[PDB]
Every structure is written in structure tokens, then in C-alpha cells.
Amino acid sequence: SIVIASAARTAVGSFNGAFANTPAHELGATVISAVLERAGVAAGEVNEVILGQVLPAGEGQNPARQAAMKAGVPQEATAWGMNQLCGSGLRAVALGMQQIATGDASIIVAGGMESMSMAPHCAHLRGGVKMGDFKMIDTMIKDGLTDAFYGYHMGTTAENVAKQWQLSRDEQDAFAVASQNKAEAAQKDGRFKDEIVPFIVKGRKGDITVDADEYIRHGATLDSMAKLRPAFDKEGTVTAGNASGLNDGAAAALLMSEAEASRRGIQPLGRIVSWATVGVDPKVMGTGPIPASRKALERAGWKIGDLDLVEANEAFAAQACAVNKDLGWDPSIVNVNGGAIAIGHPIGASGARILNTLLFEMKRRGARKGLATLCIGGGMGVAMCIESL
Amino acid sequence: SIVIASAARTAVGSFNGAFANTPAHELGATVISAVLERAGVAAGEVNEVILGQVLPAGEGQNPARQAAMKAGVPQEATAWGMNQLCGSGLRAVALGMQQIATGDASIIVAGGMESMSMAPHCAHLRGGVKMGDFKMIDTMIKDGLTDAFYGYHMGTTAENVAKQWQLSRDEQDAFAVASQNKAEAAQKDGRFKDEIVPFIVKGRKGDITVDADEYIRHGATLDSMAKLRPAFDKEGTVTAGNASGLNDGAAAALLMSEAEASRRGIQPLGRIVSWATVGVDPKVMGTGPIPASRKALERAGWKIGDLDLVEANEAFAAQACAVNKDLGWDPSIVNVNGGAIAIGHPIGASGARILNTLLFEMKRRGARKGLATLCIGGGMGVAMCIESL
Amino acid sequence: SIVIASAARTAVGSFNGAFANTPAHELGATVISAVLERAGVAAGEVNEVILGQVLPAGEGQNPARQAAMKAGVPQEATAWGMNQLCGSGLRAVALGMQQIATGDASIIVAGGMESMSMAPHCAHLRGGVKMGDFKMIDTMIKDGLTDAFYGYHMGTTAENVAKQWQLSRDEQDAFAVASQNKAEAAQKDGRFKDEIVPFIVKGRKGDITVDADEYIRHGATLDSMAKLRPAFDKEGTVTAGNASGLNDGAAAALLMSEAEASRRGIQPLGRIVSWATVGVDPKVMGTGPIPASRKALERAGWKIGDLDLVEANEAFAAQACAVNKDLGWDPSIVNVNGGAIAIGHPIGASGARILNTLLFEMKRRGARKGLATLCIGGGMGVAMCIESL
Amino acid sequence: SIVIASAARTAVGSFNGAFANTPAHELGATVISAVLERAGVAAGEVNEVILGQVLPAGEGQNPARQAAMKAGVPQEATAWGMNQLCGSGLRAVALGMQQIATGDASIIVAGGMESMSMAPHCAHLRGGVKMGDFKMIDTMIKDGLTDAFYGYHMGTTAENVAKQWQLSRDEQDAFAVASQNKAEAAQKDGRFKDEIVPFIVKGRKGDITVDADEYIRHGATLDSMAKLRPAFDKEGTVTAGNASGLNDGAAAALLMSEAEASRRGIQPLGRIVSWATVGVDPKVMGTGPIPASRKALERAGWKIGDLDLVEANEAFAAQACAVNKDLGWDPSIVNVNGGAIAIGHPIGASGARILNTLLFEMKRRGARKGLATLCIGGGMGVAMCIESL
Ligand SMILES: CC(C)(COP(=O)(O)OP(=O)(O)OC[C@H]1O[C@@H](n2cnc3c(N)ncnc32)[C@H](O)[C@@H]1OP(=O)(O)O)[C@@H](O)C(=O)NCCC(=O)NCCS
Ligand SMILES: CC(C)(COP(=O)(O)OP(=O)(O)OC[C@H]1O[C@@H](n2cnc3c(N)ncnc32)[C@H](O)[C@@H]1OP(=O)(O)O)[C@@H](O)C(=O)NCCC(=O)NCCS
Ligand SMILES: CC(C)(COP(=O)(O)OP(=O)(O)OC[C@H]1O[C@@H](n2cnc3c(N)ncnc32)[C@H](O)[C@@H]1OP(=O)(O)O)[C@@H](O)C(=O)NCCC(=O)NCCS
């Protein structure tokens, strides 16, 4: 019944890098237009735009709506943002699928968008500060990466999972290197080109077109990896090297009923067979994908063994290993072209980013069943099952 | 099919007033536990919490999850925030309804929360400011009350509707006084008591229980109304007295299938018969409710005249008069107990606030069909049809 | 040789009190004007204006010049600010005296001004913060009241004195209360009237004339003093009651040679017979007055017993008791009209403020020899000897 | 009677350049140490440190003391900051001269220090900002470079000077370029090494020794100067190229009586024969050096023509030309090694920076009579006459 007609994602920028001064809606705009062009659908036919975005402080009213208009979706359509933190990008797509499923909409553009670079610093200053210093809060750290119940960073949650699952430094380092190597491989081979829609960084002293994931590191060594210091736990195991990064980017999908696609001559990227969201302990939020993935499979009537390709987000090597280890899926069909440790992790957009990767890889290799999953801070998981047509 | 088993809202506080230093998720928690208590449903049976909230900057990771956990909803359920500006609160109820409708969940707590008071000032400072003054941005104004396309305040959008619908100052002023008198009348007769759930302002030098809408003004006079100066257009017609206020508040509804309600012996506040969202020109966003309410009515199979009760959000006097003028519904059955001009307008929570009033009024006067509707910044409208059982 | 022809000070404002939004140069202007007027001297005859001021951040270019110009001092004259912390106001007069002494000026206006209320919060943001919160530093605290070598407040230096000299809480409290009672008595008898020049707080909704020290507490009780908690050392002895306050004000003196005063028919407030500044350990900065007073007396050819009156600044009860104890001067001739615990402490202005108090009470009671001294953060003292004519 | 026994200055840093994050007191300490070393004078014999500094906000209590204590001056000695804007650095040495003159000290360290780069942004937030955006004020611009009466930059006073003296853009640029080329040639020949004491910028990933004036431009061309846009008056004449820069540095002199230097066997850098400070119209502040230099020369009993070397600060090419045109001194003996357009303008230090320059060059060519003068914001000038021994 509901299918992904087309899809597109911008390249992933490094922190304060290529998209350093680009507002997330800009990145979104471009992705909205791309999904539209790639399927032959006119913006005028878009009913609603849903965009997962975790840090929009200071971008103005509802960046989802700004993105949609910038791209040309008429003012008669609707737009909104939503936040399930890292699962935002993937959840948006589910939510959009429900819009068509309940007959409230026909065509939806959904995904995520995020400019971690552009997240501001803030302070509550309405009462006034009579005396003494006050903190100017980094909304990126406070609103997107800090557990609100234990007050510590996601990296600490990762450390909790490492200890629990007895995942050594070498084993988390091994996983990261492989991720880099696979992402680099995929980049060289043209593997990211279909899914990437080039973005034009509007300059003054010149325009710059970005069309390659700039965070991927070429020739990542195990030696450099092993020399890094732990980033969260002073005598910890998680490092800048075996953890995803801070990044900017956008990604989305054009959804419509399978029938509609058919009436249009569109060859869909896949059929949304099922999706699931489940909570877990915030302290070990990285385990999220276990229950969520299993729930999704259950709802789809699929067995883990049925999957031909998987995209399980790499928030941290320790959590990625734990997930794989627990689920037991064949490592070889998970993050085939690299994961977030190499590609980057634009919070609100990452679920749609990985959906794009999964979808273009399933088409290129001819896989039939796929699943995308992500862990969520605060202790949640989100998963989606896709079947090719 | 999907029914609102129960509902609850906090009192709406004034700006920097009773809830001045209360983070939205604390009010959210209170309301979520009320709805459970009220229906006789255990926190453990909640699948997900959906909370619209337009201004979470500074509150920490996903305040929706923080509300849920604080209220006792286990770590197993899931939670998420969403933004459709002033339509957030109502929209969230519709999205939860769809969670159930598609069989993804059984029981959802939905609504919105907002702390305008706690909205911080911010500035993007990662790049640094090498020389020169820079502006500290009020995020409530920028991210909540400023049109992103024309750069002006919602108040100006109100002025655009005023001029277009030829709504004089005296006519808006009249409308405002009536809403105050009607909000004061209803407060005096205990008409807001079922819906309100007292909120304990945790103090140090005393704990204060808030259970009354503090923003309503007792004895509002037309003379005082007519002496106020225009707040947005220097030679304008919109003023502080005929515009909604800056407020805090949280409201929610407990949703489940009609059959489930029946299995539990619950007496539902009503069945969600339909809902809709439609866009309009951002310049005259106040018109939002016209196209959305009609759509909602159309999807429900109802005529405007079928409606027994109506709650149409009082963003601004200008817009409310325009809405009523166009739709033509009998004025006496619209905002019977007063509106946002008197009660307050906690952006992200207002759509669920007005559903509460609609729902407890419908039960108290035995009205069968009702409709809630709100105008949304950026040019959008949201509407919902509820029928009692 | 060099005399003080006239002097004047504004009443001392409470923190965020009467002068909450008055820039220090405005208060300085009025005192410049008063001193001129009081001496029969025209602003066109001033050669230079010298004003200590420790916290001028945000006031604009050299506020000493802004004060001079506001007062009508001709653009041909010159102005400069200086900072020797709490000894600033007194040091200026010394430096003004030396302008005359060396023949480079004939007529100087010298004193101090300080708006502790208008001191701003700041941050160095040229480089940008790539991530993480940063502090907004209270400049009042940082640049005015925090020792730069040990990182702690001036109050902690008070605690180090308390301990070392074995001054109990009780003794400190007794000192504070006698300060209050004496200042209150002098206020009520009209003792502060000759020295205060009334300041007009330019309002919108009315102008307010301030001509009374508002910080002096009427009816101060020992019981209320003794229940206060330690302000700097959780199990300390220094409290808000026994410490000076945070205050606003300005004060100055018009200087010229004795022979010039005589050609003008002026009866001068006194002859500057000597002055001195000496350092001590920063940890016990409050002991500054000891060596500076002893040095001034020696330069004057005076024994301690020759003094008729003394003004020794009350930075803190603890340090004031220590200075009196060590010096051994008759306590009844010290701060006879109350001191800074009661009157307040506008840092840059206080040395000139207590020099006004000394001058006008030496005239009133016919005291022939007087000395004014103040303790300075960072470990310094300043003292000056005055002889009537 | 009072001689400059030795002197020293750091190299001048570019804005956010080599000393981007070096607090001024650190650079002052190194200059304190250097004067001491250069004269065979131990830090224990210093009585007082006087350092001009215009922008100390956020550096902590009295940076002159912090510099003195870092250099090892005993805690028994004293220190203070003063501010007469751009003539601060020179005013201080006149001020130190006066201490010895009047017998209050025997050995003084005086000069100035500034780090424009470390100046912060601020806001007065004590009263609170109920709502709306507020300004974060660059203290360098506001407190250092804007006229307090006319509200415009020091550069617009430059434009005023340009029109009034009819100084074309061409004349300005050619003085600018000749400044650059003489500083480049004295840099290259080694004429700045005697005056400069190397500064070690404490690294983490390496200590950096800074011993060269980095703002100096090598190969400055008339053509690229001529292509620059006006910086203050959109259709003006003052550009970035013919105006001084924004810089960092410190500079000082060690003073004592001529008799004292003879008892120690010190061959002094000169005798301070006179100084003068005079005001002028704030709108043409750049003309300050005119009356100040004539005044100093008359107190010295010298004719303009007796001077052998002159250092006249380059605030802007337009005022520099005006000052040279009126005084009429031979241009060939003015700033023979370049000036501030090329070397840099750390406001509080500049006066002392150009005295060093003066001093060293009078020594090297055997000049007997020299003068150092500087224009001061707010309408003022300072100048000093030096005679070799
Ligand atoms: C891990 C984290 C704290 C690192 O932040 P940081 O310290 O500012 O990161 P950096 O990139 O500066 O790391 C420091 C260095 O490690 C180096 N580094 C990173 N990966 C490397 C690799 N694979 N090999 C070699 N060096 C590497 C960087 O190049 C850098 O070198 P430098 O110090 O010379 O600049 C941050 O990326 C983070 O919080 N990430 C995401 C975590 C998260 O919770 N995401 C949400 C998911 S739940
Ligand atoms: C209208 C608005 C700009 C007013 O802001 P403000 O100037 O800070 O408001 P205030 O409450 O201070 O109004 C000033 C005065 O009006 C007075 N006032 C308000 N309503 C009044 C009435 N009915 N009768 C008499 N006086 C009244 C207040 O009491 C106050 O008196 P004071 O000056 O002695 O304090 C603000 O309410 C606003 O933007 N509101 C919401 C509009 C909006 O866009 N909502 C989103 C919906 S799309
Ligand atoms: C001591 C100090 C830290 C107090 O700051 P604060 O805590 O914000 O001060 P407050 O005025 O709020 O004092 C707190 C309370 O004590 C009370 N209080 C003060 N003196 C009192 C007295 N004599 N009797 C009774 N109550 C008294 C105040 O009235 C107030 O009551 P409240 O809590 O109901 O408002 C501040 O004054 C300070 O730093 N002072 C001296 C500064 C200094 O170092 N200056 C340079 C000297 S080198």
C-alpha cells in the first residue's frame, strides 16, 4: 500500500565545515526539490512536508515550512517538524506513511534535516541576573547529546553499553576502521552518487557545490585509532575515532500509495512493509535497536534471516557491535558502504540519511528485503522494514 | 473507532507569572498523570507520549520523554515532540489517533506543553564574532512569533486580516471584552474545574498550588480597552487587549480505540470523527481555520449547522472575527467560556487546551457534535471534529 | 602649597537602587559642577579632571572626559580615569595634587565615580566557541571584587584577616551595628547635608531628586545581624551585615595651590600635608591601611596621637577592627558619622567619598588634623593627611 | 632630574594574531622584566608600576598589579592602571616621572599594555530584558574607538580632519605606503631588535617566541592601497589601508632620578625635559598633537627646529598629515622607522610603544633632542620632550 517513490539526501558536512553557516531548511529545501524531480512529481502536488529536526533554535518559525516553501511547495500545503532525537529522520517517514494510510494525504515528503553547526548558545534571561556569572548554554550539547535523566553525554551511555557487553577498545576500534574503510570504498566507487543531491553553498566570493561526504576519512589506520584518548570517560573506551561525529545534512523521501506510483509510471525504491518504535533504559539507550528491529520484523512477518541488507546507525562503535552481536544478523549485510562513524551523524536527519543509503543500495545490488534502525537518546529505538518492487 | 477516554490541562499561567521558572515537561508530567488517573489507566499501559511544543530550546533532550518518565510512564513506552506552531497541541491528538488507527499502538497520551517564560535568548557563536556588536535573540519571538517569510510578527499578520476584512478597532475591542467577560463568567461558576488539574509549583520558601487561569481579567472594561495603543502597527488596530497573550500551560488527552474504552468500563469524552490541516497565505495566517474546519466537516460528513459547540482559537480579535464571519456558525456556540485572549495562549499547548474546554463543555451541556480549530503561523490551519457517545 | 578648595559627593545609592540605570559619568558630572560652584570657580578655569573608576566597561570612551564635558569643562581642558581599585577615589586627589606640585596644572578636579549597578556581563567571543557552554562573566565581580592571584572574593581576604587577628563574629557584628547607628544618627542630625550635592535622576514619568544615602539602615538590630549566614566561607564569620555593600555614587574635590586659593578669597577645606600608598600580601589586603597610614604620618611628621579625626574605610568589619587594633588610634575619632558598612561602597568613588566625610566633619567640629585611609584588593593601602587652615 | 634608565616593548601583534589569546598583563610582565634586566635593576627595588590600559574588561582586578606580581615586583610595592585613551602609554611615563619629582617614589616602571584581541562583548543584564532582542556590545569598539559625544568612530573624526585640511585620498595613501616601506626597511635592517623584548606565547602544542612586528606589510603597493574602499564614510577617504590597525602589545620604561642612575652607573636612554597634555574639539581629535607638542616644546624652552627626531603617532594618515602640516617639522625626522599604520596601534600601549621607538633610534643615530606625541579620542593630545645624556 504505501511506497517510497524516490529519495535524496545532501552530502554530510563536517562540523563547522562545508555547511558551517547553512541553515538546515536550506539543506532541506534542496532535498525536497530533489525527491520531487527524481520522481517526476510537481511541488504543487505535495500535500505535506514532515521533517525531523532536533536543534532548530533561532532558525525562526517552523523550519519545515520554510524548507517546503523555499522548495516551491505551494502555501496551500502543510509542513511540520518533529523530534524523536536521532530516530527523528526515520520516524518522519513512518509518520508520513500513516498520513496516506489513514487517507488524510496522498503525497508526502518526509525525512530529517539538521545543522548542528548552526545550533546557537542560549540563556534564560527574562528575570535578569542581579549578580554573578551565568551560563550561555550550547543547545547542541544540552538539547541533542545530553541524557536528560542522568545529566551525562550519550558517549557515557555508550560506555555503559561497552562495559555491559564487555566490548574492548580494540574491538570498538576495529569496527570503526572497518566503517571508514567501507565508506571510503563506497565513495571512490560512485556508490554515494545516486542518493546524493549536490547542494550549492551560496557564497559571496564564489559559490561552492558540495556533492561528497566530507567527514569520511581516507586511509584510516588502526594505529592512529589506538592512540586516541577516551572522550567521555577519562579511563574509558569510547574515543572521537570510534564514535560518530557532529555534522550537518538533510535527507528525505517522496511517499505515495503504491497505486498512485503505478498510475504515474514511477518505479518505487521500496514498499514500507512495517516500522516499530520501543523504549529501553536511558542509561543503555544504545541497545534501542534490538527490540525495535525485532518488533518491526514481527510486524512485517519477517525473520532476521529474511533480510538481504541492513542499515543500523553507528552512534558509537560499542553500541553498534552490541546490536549486531545481539541480533546476530550477518555482519556482511550491515552498513555495506560504511556507517555514521565515517559518514557523520546529523541528528535529526540521520534516520532519513540511512534510509537513502539502504534504498539506493537495495536497488543497485537487487536486494529484496531491507531494514534501517537507529538507537535514540533517552532510551528508545526505531526500525523500518522495506521490500523492493 | 478512536475515542478520547479522558483529558486534563493545567491552569494557563501569565508570562513570567506563576509558571515563570517551570520547565514545560514538569507541567506535561502533571497532565499526563492526570489523564491516566482520570480514566483509571495505569502509566504502564501507555505505548507513547506525543507532545507538541514549539519552544524547547534549553530544556534538554526530548522534553516529551522527560515528561513521560517524570509522570511514571515506563522506559519501555516511547515519546516524541512535534511542532506545527499553534496547531501543535491539536495536531498531536490527531497523530496519536493515527498511531492507534494503523495498529501501531493501543494507548497514547497526546497534547502539548509550553513554557514561553522559560524560552531563552540565543546567538550562534561557533564562528565567533571578530569585531562589532551582535544581537541576542529572544527565541520565543524569533522561533515562535515571527513570520519567517516576511520577518514581521504574527500581530502584523493580524493587521493584514483586519484591513482585508474591514474589522474596525471597536469591533475587535468588543470581541475581546466579551471573551474576558465570558472567561470570567465561566471561571466564577466553576466551569473550568473539571478540565484543570492543579499544578504544584515546587518552591523553597513555600510550595504553591496553581489551579486557576491567572491570565483572565476580572471586570474588563471597554473604556480601558479603547485607550490602549496598537502593539504592532503604530497606527494599527491590534493591541495587547485584543490580542492573545504570552503564556505557559500544558494539556493532554488519553486516546484508545472505542472498543478498548468499552473493555475498560470508561465513559469517553468523545470520538474523534475527523481532523484536517490546510495551508493558506502566511500573510493572512489568521484565516487558517476557515479551510481546515470546512475540510474537517467535509471528512466527518457534517454541515456547519450540525455543530453544537465550537472552540476556535483566539490568536487575535481580528482573526477570530474573520473566522466566524466567513464560516457563519452561530456565535453563541463558539468559545462559550471565553478564549485565548482571556485565558492565554501557550503556543504548543493551546490546541490541546481548547480541546479540553470543548470536551468538558460538551459533556456539561450535553452537546453531541463539536469542533476545535486553530490558525497556525506560516499560513496553516488545523481542525478536529468530536462527537460524544 | 596644595589645598582642597571645596568638595562634594552625591548621596550613595544602593545596588540596583536609586541609581540603578545611571551611568557613573552622570553622577561625576553633578559632583564636578558642585565643586566648582562651591568654590566660586568657573568650569572654564579647570585644567584637568581626574576620576578613579574601576568598572567603566560599556560606558564608552573615557567616562572621565564625558563627565568633564557634561559639566561644562571646556574642550581645551583634559580628563583621564585611573584605577587602583578601592583606593582610586583617594589616589586621584593625590595625583591631582602632584599635577599642581610639579607646575603642570593650576586647577584640578579629582575624585572617583562608580556605577556598580551599571557594570555589565561579558564574554571574549572573537575566537568563537566551537562547542560547549561558556560563562557570561559579571564584570563587577571579576574586575572589581575577586582577587586575581588566589581567585577568591575580597570577603575571603576578610576571612583570612578575621582568623589571623582572632576577631569573632560577635565583635564584627558589634562593629557593623555601631556603624549603622552612627551613620543613622549623623543622617538624622543633618551631618551629611553639606557634603551631599543632590542628584536628579532624569526620569520619563517623573524626575527624582536623590539627596539621602539610601543604604544606611534605620534601627539596625544586633539580633538581626547575628542570625545572618556567612556570605563567603560556609562556616565563616563575614556576612552581608558586617561587610560593605555594592553601591553607586561619585565624589570629588577641587584642588589648587594655597596661594591661588588665597588670591581668590577662598577658605579651603584643608591643606594636603601628605599621602602614601604601600603594598601588603593580597591574602590580607584588608591590612593595607596599616603601613599606608603609618607612611603618610611619617611623611607628615605626625604621630598617630596628633590626629583629631580619621576616616578608615569599612570594606569589612573584620579588616576595619584589625586596622584600628594595630594602629591604636582612639576609636571614638574614627568614622564618627558611620562608615561604608552603612553608607555603602562605590569602589572607585569611595576614597573621595570618605575624604568628603572627613573634610566636612573636620570643618564642623573644628578638628585640625585628619587622615583618610582605604584597603585595596590585590594587597595595597592608600592614606592621606589633611590639616585645616 | 628624571631619566629613562632603560625601556622595552614587545613586538606588536596583529588583531586576533600572535597574541590573540594573551591577556595584556602577560605581555606587560615581560616588559616589566625586560626594563629591569636592561638597566641592572632588581625587581625588589621597584616602588610602583603604572600601566596605561584602555580595555581591561574581563581581565580581573587591576591588571597593572597582575603584571607587576608576575614580574616578581614585591607585594610591598604598588601598581595601578590609568586611561587617557591613546595617550595612556605616554601619560603613564609622565605620571611615573611626577612620582619621583615629588619624592613619593625612587624607582618606577611606567608604560602601557593592551590586548584589543582579548577585549570582550558585554551587556548590562542586571535589570533583566523582559522581551525582545538585545545587543552584545563589542567593548573595543564602544569603549576604545567610538567618540562618546558624537557617537561615531575615531575614523569619522579622521574624515573630518581630511575635509578640513583638504587632504586627498592620494596624499593619504602615499603617506600610508611610505609608512609601510620605512617600517619594512627598519624591520629588515634590524632597527627594531634593541627595543623589542621577545614574548613567549605559551603553547600546549608548542611555545612560540614572538620577536617581530607582524602587522608590518612587506611589499605594500600604492595600487592595492588605492583600490581599497572607504571604511567609515561610504564616500570618504579613510580606508583600512591608511588607518592604524587593531593590535596587541605592551611597552614600558624604567624611571629614576638622574642622580640615582649616576650612583648606579647607568647610562640612561634620556632625560625627561617636559611633557604636556592639551584638549581640542572631539570632532577633530586627530589634531591633539598640535597644541600638546607646542606646549611641551615651550615648557622645554625649545623651538620646533631644535628637535632632532620626532615620533608622532599614526592614528590615521589624514590626521598624521594634518599634524605634520601645521607643526611644520621636517618630515624626514618624523617616524624615521615607520609608524602605527604599519606597526600597529594597541591603544593603551602605543604611547610607550612610540617612546621606545623614539629612544632607541635617538641612541642609534646620536640624536640629542626628540619628541613623542599622540592624538587622543574625545579631543586631546599628549607630548613629551626627551634629551640625551
Ligand atoms: C566524540 C566527540 C565528543 C569528539 O568531539 P571533539 O573532541 O571536539 O572531536 P574532534 O574531531 O576534535 O577529535 C579530536 C581529534 O581526533 C581526531 N580523530 C577523529 N577520528 C579520527 C580517526 N578515525 N583517526 C585519527 N584521528 C581521528 C580528529 O582529527 C582531531 O584531531 P585534532 O585534535 O588534531 O583536531 C564528538 O564527536 C561527539 O559528541 N560526537 C557524537 C556523539 C553523539 O552522542 N552523537 C549522538 C548519537 S547518540
Ligand atoms: C500584544 C503583545 C505584543 C503585548 O506585549 P507587552 O507590551 O510586553 O504587554 P503588556 O502586558 O506589558 O501590555 C502593556 C500594558 O497593557 C495592559 N493591558 C493588557 N490588556 C489590557 C486590558 N484588557 N485592559 C487594560 N489594560 C490592558 C497591561 O496591563 C499593561 O499595563 P502596564 O503598561 O501598566 O504593565 C504580546 O501580548 C504578544 O505578542 N502577544 C501574543 C500575540 C501572538 O502573536 N501570539 C501567537 C499567536 S499567532
Ligand atoms: C556581602 C555580599 C556578598 C552580600 O551580597 P548579597 O547576598 O546579594 O546581599 P544582600 O543585600 O542580598 O544580603 C542578603 C540579605 O541580608 C540582609 N541584611 C544585610 N545587612 C543586614 C543587617 N545589618 N541587618 C539585617 N539584615 C541585613 C539583607 O537585607 C538581605 O535580606 P533578604 O535576603 O531578605 O533580601 C555583597 O554585599 C558584597 O560582596 N559586599 C561587599 C563587597 C566587597 O568585597 N567590596 C569591595 C571590598 S574590598
Ligand SMILES: CC(C)(COP(=O)(O)OP(=O)(O)OC[C@H]1O[C@@H](n2cnc3c(N)ncnc32)[C@H](O)[C@@H]1OP(=O)(O)O)[C@@H](O)C(=O)NCCC(=O)NCCS
Ligand atoms: C580600519 C578598520 C575598520 C579595518 O577593520 P576591518 O575592516 O575589519 O579590517 P581589515 O584589516 O580586515 O580590512 C583590510 C582589508 O583590506 C586589506 N588591506 C589593509 N591594508 C592594506 C594595504 N596597505 N594594502 C592592501 N590591502 C590592504 C586587508 O588585507 C583586508 O583585506 P581582506 O578583507 O581581503 O582580508 C580597523 O582596522 C580600524 O578600525 N582601525 C582603527 C584604529 C583606530 O581607530 N584606533 C584608535 C585611533 S584614535
